Chain length 421, copies 4
């Protein structure tokens, strides 16, 4: 509605509430605040244009404003059509960020807006899911040589970009921010663990304790989702295709079965595979009446909605972010958040302190691209662990935690080999 050359938002009059959300979470983001103070002093992004595809809530907004405080000209598009928070996006538009996003936008608008964000002709692309980096290579090839590099937030995006590199069509360097220690060990595990159940509880008002919770995938996200589900009193069943991770889940005290056996007994199903069709026709047919299904992975393809639609004689919407599929025999199965990221659609995403660290790495990755892209090949890179170390020490210090320091004798001992029994 409020839609022009510089932005396309639902309603600019929502900006005051968006500003309050941005100010609130920024009070609990000490690492990005530390970085923002440096950016304001040195203005390292003066004259630099940045286009970002991220989940457009208040922590994302604070990162974009941090990049702007460093001198950058920033455009932004949504990483998911349903995760955008309209009031936050109005505040971004008021701040001069060229943001193009409306909550609930269509898939075609999702890409029409992504193109508009790309119109800034970015030097740096910040991506979440690799849609924007892929879109440039497919439909905006005229702009490739102007792009220094990109940084990718999530596992699904890194998988896509590595396949792009394998096929020889990646045309600029990419930082796999997801692969940094202070990202996947914290965001993917602890962040997703809390916010997935935050969203499921918010959407349903249902009890987690005494439920059979089925977690499909025992990677970093599945681990955290299973961890916190157990912490909320649930009986957790893990479904995995990796035999090593399946044994880990056993040692962690969780049941391990395949997806058909899990489908018969699960009360709540959560997918975190980054894969396609992990739950489909024959699993829905086995599910108990009232089964809750949620996706915490990527896009909307982990739980195969077309199979649910073919089984349903009625499709209803009893609550916001709850789609009811009524089957022939009268069973009703419930899909949360239209099969999209339940933590970001049914809730407010990861907590502020988690995205502080993930978006601190993103800020450092943008600086790394700015300053090293000419020595980098069109390949996927991981940030040096020194940046991980810096983010961790800033967080610990803001926490008031002082850790042991190695003595010179101990450093010597760890490099030696003669001191045995």
């Amino acid at each position: 509605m409020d839609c022009g050359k510089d932005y396309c938002v639902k309603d600019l009059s929502l900006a005051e509430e968006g500003w309050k959300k941005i100010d609130w979470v920024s009070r609990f983001m000490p690492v990005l605040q530390y970085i923002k103070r440096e950016f304001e002093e040195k203005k390292p992004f003066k004259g630099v244009r940045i286009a970002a595809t991220l989940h457009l809530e208040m922590k994302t907004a604070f990162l974009l404003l941090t990049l702007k405080a460093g001198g950058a000209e920033v455009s932004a598009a949504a990483s998911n059509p349903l995760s955008t928070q309209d009031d936050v996006v109005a505040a971004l538009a008021k701040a001069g960020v060229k943001v193009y996003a409306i909550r609930g936008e269509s898939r075609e608008q999702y890409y029409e807006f992504m193109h508009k964000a790309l119109d800034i002709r970015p030097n740096i692309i910040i991506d979440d899911g690799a849609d924007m980096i892929s879109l440039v290579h497919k439909e905006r090839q005229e702009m490739l040589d102007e792009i220094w590099g990109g940084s990718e937030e999530t596992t699904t995006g890194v998988i896509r970009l590595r396949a792009m590199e394998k096929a020889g069509i990646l045309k600029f360097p990419v930082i796999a921010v997801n692969d940094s220690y202070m990202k996947y060990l914290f965001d993917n595990r602890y962040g997703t663990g809390q916010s997935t159940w935050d969203g499921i509880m918010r959407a349903t008002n249902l009890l987690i304790a005494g439920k059979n919770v089925v977690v499909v995938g025992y990677g970093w996200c599945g681990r955290g989702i299973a961890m916190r589900a157990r912490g909320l009193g649930a009986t957790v069943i893990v479904v995995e295709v990796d035999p090593i991770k399946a044994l880990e889940a056993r040692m962690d005290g969780f049941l391990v079965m395949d997806m058909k056996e899990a489908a018969k007994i699960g009360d709540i199903f959560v997918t975190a595979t980054g894969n396609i069709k992990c739950i489909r026709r024959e699993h829905f047919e086995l599910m108990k009446d009232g089964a809750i299904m949620a996706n915490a992975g990527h896009f909307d393809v982990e739980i195969w909605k077309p199979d649910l639609e073919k089984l349903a004689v009625e499709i209803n919407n009893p609550r916001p972010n709850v789609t009811e599929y009524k089957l022939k025999d009268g069973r009703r199965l419930y899909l949360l958040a239209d099969g999209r990221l339940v933590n970001l659609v049914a809730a407010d995403g990861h907590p502020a302190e988690i995205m502080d660290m993930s978006f601190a790495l993103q800020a450092k990755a943008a600086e790394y691209i700015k300053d090293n892209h000419e020595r980098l090949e069109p390949k996927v890179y991981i940030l040096p662990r020194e940046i991980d170390e810096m983010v961790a020490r800033i967080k610990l210090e803001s926490m008031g935690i002082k850790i042991e320091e190695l003595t010179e004798e101990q450093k010597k001992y760890l490099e030696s080999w003669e001191h045995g029994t």
Copy 2:
């Protein structure tokens, strides 16, 4: 605004959304559904008038509709001015329940509406905090003849009523529903454990893991809040006045210290004491910058607001359900939900399956009073344990769980003494 003899609600046009909310949670309340079918078949409350003071959200609405389906004429008032959900109440007014409640009620409206609810001339009073039963004894003594009895939902109300009995001011029988095994072992512990953190995450979007969570009170609510806080990754510090429960918290793996020591290190404070001034002036003075405070117990007197106001040079409202008290030294302390029941004010209360068992007991208590008021004395009773077992057996059956049966030989062994060795 939509106010009359039979109801007083904010907006009747919100009823359609309220109905969707009631329909939803009712799908996950099997025990109360079992009872509603019995009530609908037999109509045990035909001609009976029931006045209820409860937290007016969707699970409460299904309890009130279940009583109406049993033939009762039902009036309803809010148990807390900020827990009422206006769309649910609109649906109750449309359903013929004489409900008088608006979210954000003044204290004067709170008691005016409770008086309007009493105008039904009830035979049975269902109470939640003992305000209504106290109000009849103070201001509506002409109602005492017609009143068969009352039922009290919560710990705080039962304490008040037992005190009224001790002083000899109680005039009609009272069922202490809170004292049923199927209530305080589940509602108070598991329900409050989940819904307290549901509300805290919803209000703040902050990380629970790696925080110092201080839980004041290690009763049934405190146990649950502490258990789920640990499940979400927090370090938990328990503050108690009972030495036995303090040792229980230690053995459960939690730190135990006094309120002053806890105030210095806590990041999030949760009170669940049912007592007054468990966090007060001297504790606020010790708290770290950015401390989060929330009350999970009765009323709003556990965290003493007047002390916060006197310390504050500025009182701000950065988020819905977050009050910011800025102190002279620049520190900011955040009180959630105005110091009232954080699960019911900042979220949707206990999950549906928990309220199913609690309100099943309430429905049984109302039927118990109906069937026994001529045999009861003006004192506090607890439901026979056979009702607890019925509720637990209906729930287990609806879960598809069948448990081991105690054999006749085993029963006789348990009543013998000669078989030792």
Copy 3:
């Protein structure tokens, strides 16, 4: 072998090692040490004779020596033929305690020794399982009028004594020490939780994580056994006959099924029912090859050994405290500790700090019997909660823990009823 009028022990030359065990655990028993200092000063048991039936390890020995330091003449017999520690018992004999116990003694010696302990003509009987109190009523009735009272340590004994009271044959007062808050909330739960797995690991050297652990009974012992099993990485399945406790186990995150379904899937079975024949023929027939079975309840009747013997074509003993039952189809099932208390036969029983509190109550119960038995009927009593409070405050102080104290305003508030919304 070293067997006379004053004692019957395996070998007095083992006393030096027994003294060291007694000294060791006594360093970590601050509550009983506190009581012992009082006893040494006041000598309240001067001229009093005490006969005890307890598990004769080093914590029991310290209680008996504490009673002796108070002036008592003490005799002792084993509460279980397999839990006696011969070196501890030699030290007791060297100390002047009239102890009659040899590890591995027969059932007939178990009672022959119990009679010898009774020959002291006790004023006070301290019992664990009610064998001695029952033996007096059956076979030593000539001595009843000389006995002031008894105290019973465990749930199984209290069950027997209450049945004795019901039948009208209990002839002196009995203190149900097991029923004290500081007993069953700590000994039965936390003590049994740790020491059961202490014994199972010691006997087997097998992994607990990633195992299906079946806990039969979800009372105080079963809760703790399930708690700690989960803490060691196991998948815990709870078998219960109480529907309320079955739901508790669900809410605590454990599977709940009946014993036939549990038998098919369990890797380790632990009984804590205090009942007879909870695991029998048809369950053994369903068990997987290599199933481990252990009893943590009472006697050796919870797992029905006669059924295992009838199924076995070979009975072997591959490890100390491991009996192998080789079945017709080649399956091998393993019973720990001959079906007796696995924590006390395969290990060293509860940890010292736990039995500090249980045996502190026992010392206070003996004092309570001494001083109140003439005002007591031949019935089962529970100690006043003031003693529970005293034990808890001594433990907290020895721990360096200072708890909140109620203000006079708060005490007033909890007795009031007028202060509502």
Copy 4:
């Protein structure tokens, strides 16, 4: 005492008990049983000579017998002077393994026996701490021609060997078995987590719940020790030098502080660093009376014994595997197992099912060296991940667990980039 050219053991007559111990744990080692049948059928080590330095208990004996069943001639020496179990070693001598070990070995005997084990002129060396591989490089350089390669079991040894490679002193290939997923994710974490507390309870009979447990090091062992300590009811304090791992411990719910601060409040201290002097003079000076200290890492240098001896006015031995250092102010600090591997010295090491997977990898590593030594360089290698997957699949199958299979469509999706949205 029973010493000769082919073996040196304490007492050959202990062999019968050693065999029972080997037979027992072998029943619960399915993966190594699977490999032993393959080895027995194919005899891949016919004519091969293998010298091993391992902790000589029953699971090690089954590994050595499995290699012998494959046709290998096997010599064995102790990996630690106090972890050897004399009856197991007696059985190995009876079985034809050239084992030279006695529990309680002097340091001189330790290296004399390791030299006797090397007299076999091995083709493959299996090492556990890199003492033997270091000893060949220092004192048996004439052996270097015939040596195909070595395999290192543990973190400390791999560090030594990688340092030897860096300095260019390594002369033959080395397999870093510790670096296999199926090893360090399970042995180091879950195995050490259980067996450390197994040993601590066995030595002390003290309560774990409600204690302040300080874990020094949050690597794989530290993670496991902390996780199981929390599972047993303790409050866990983590001391780290890695800032990333320190934040992991916080998010896992543990307190994080430096060694001096932890020394003031810890009740039980466990070191798992693989480093020297992580607890030393200044820390002992701060410790509470009665502090328990134990080492779960390499050698006995993590807790610096010489500092304890200098502080002590008295050194006593109140229990087996408990050394008491009485300080000038009367405080008593207790070091378990002489500061050596507490799980292996005060207990029976890792449980059998854990060592099954670790020693399956060792058997595969020995076969790998046999099959690849002519293609390898004098540097440190890690086994191909296909062997990890084989071990995990054999274990899952023996558990009756069948996991979901990755479909061809899903594999192709994971190698694509065009499918976004």
